[PDB]
Ligand SMILES: Cc1cc(N2CCNCC2)nc(C)n1
């Protein structure tokens with residue numbers, strides 16, 4: 001049991017207003033046939049156009065919400081809406097495009113999906129709240145067949161061209177007119193009562209209903225993300241490397257060690273309260289401090305209330321020493337804190353749009369993160385960039401230009417001239433820092449933090 005059986009039942013109640021008379025007893029096999037597609041008994045990698053909830057979750061980067069609304073069914077114009085905010089009007093003769101025949105509409109669909117997905121996924125998963133017109137419109141822009149490879153590379157084919165009779169992936173599809181072997185899932189099959197807006201609005205206040213197809217497409221995808229990544233969480237699912245994952249994760253470890261080590265040297269806290277990931281290891285193993293750990297899994301719905309994390313009777317006194325909240329999202333951090341908080345607003349290939357202002361950060365695992373809120377940091381300040389090192393000034397073993405920087409906190413800089421080793425390490429550290437910041441991570445610290453207190457650790 002890996003793929004969704006075509007002989008699985010499909011509930012058709014949601015389809016009967018667009019398709020009146022539709023049989024109550026229906027399989028994916030018969031639905032695909034009704035949609036105008038012929039599977040020809042093919043064992044060539046594409047067993048069903050529809051996929052399971054488990055397969056949809058493994059391919060969350062491919063999710064594109066899709067809705068079709070009748071403007072006036074062969075005789076009427078259709079408004080095609082996508083979770084990218086795009087609305088296209090197809091005539092059978094929040095971006096809104098005027099009515100155009102299907103032969104040109106399909107070219108725009110291929111361009112839009114290819115630009116949206118080329119850096120995300122090897123496929124497309126159309127996320128539906130199926131009422132009929134979206135399923136019966138697929139024949140106008142979708143072609144199916146055996147699994148194929150791109151004409152210009154080794155990636156699987158996602159597009160077809162009737163001009164050249166060739167296949168392409170999302171990177172090589174310029175000028176292609178058909179979406180080839182897409183996947184889809186109907187959210188209505190999951191067991192819901194009431195319409196799309198009533199279910200979506202139970203969990204999200206950020207997406208409205210401007211009564212256009214793209215609004216429904218966005219709400220459908222948002223509801224799917226809430227069901228799969230907010231109310232249900234699976235951290236065992238691994239996701240492929242599509243970008244700077246490894247560098248970002250290594251940079252995060254380097255920045256955490258640097259900042260915590262310097263906070264302990266500068267203010268000499270007798271105790272550190274490490275709140276978050278139950279599998280955390282001391283980021284500064286050599287530090288003298290009493291290191292106490294508190295378990296809190298990543299919050300995916302709302303940020304933790306600091307009253308629930310801290311109160312209800314541990315050193316008990318979280319006011320003693322310092323608190324470390326490394327990606328542990330709380331509503332309002334205490335004044336004595338070191339914080340790394342992911343900014344959900346960041347634009348990147350790892351950060352997908354989420355539910356109720358939140359975002360779906362996908363880097364090895366999927367983490368739905370609550371909406372970034374500047375008011376969480378009112379008792380803290382932004383942590384300034386700095387590099388600190390007590391290591392010996394010694395080169396060992398990439399040409400050189402002398403480093404001059406007020407933020408290179410080393411013995412050599414105190415002595416008036418940065419050594420080659422510390423200049424190389426400073427530049428590598430600054431690169432790691434900038435990588436982590438650009439990935440969306442934000443750093444905050446207790447107001448008394450002052451790197452001037454690090455210079456006297458060289459005596
Ligand atoms: C986005 C949308 C449109 C819509 N229609 C459009 C065609 N006329 C009837 C109203 N209905 C819903 C529930 N959502």
Ligand SMILES: [Zn+2]
Pocket residue numbers: 150151152153154155168169170171172
């Ligand atoms: Zn290709």
Ligand SMILES: [Zn+2]
Pocket residue numbers: 200204205206207218219222223354355356
């Ligand atoms: Zn929403």
Ligand SMILES: [Zn+2]
Pocket residue numbers: 392393394410411412413418419420421422
């Ligand atoms: Zn040095």
